[PDB]
Design a protein around this ligand. Structure first.
Ligand code: MG
Ligand code: MG
Length: 56
């Protein structure tokens, strides 16, 4: 199962995908990868397109 993340951070941008089992596990990892970068932002998840956004 492919989940995508949009990062629109103030210094870091991009699009990352991750192969996961539920969106629970994608969330965990992408949210940890956010912290690691120093991204604190507003999060969204659209289930139909499997896409997390996080915007600083
Ligand atoms: Mg880690
Ligand atoms: Mg670190």
């Amino acid at each position: 199962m492919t989940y995508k993340l949009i990062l629109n951070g103030k210094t870091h941008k991009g699009v990352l995908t991750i192969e996961a089992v539920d969106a629970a596990t994608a969330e965990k990892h992408f949210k940890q990868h956010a912290n690691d970068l120093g991204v604190d932002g507003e999060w969204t998840y659209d289930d139909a397109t499997k896409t997390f956004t996080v915007t600083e």
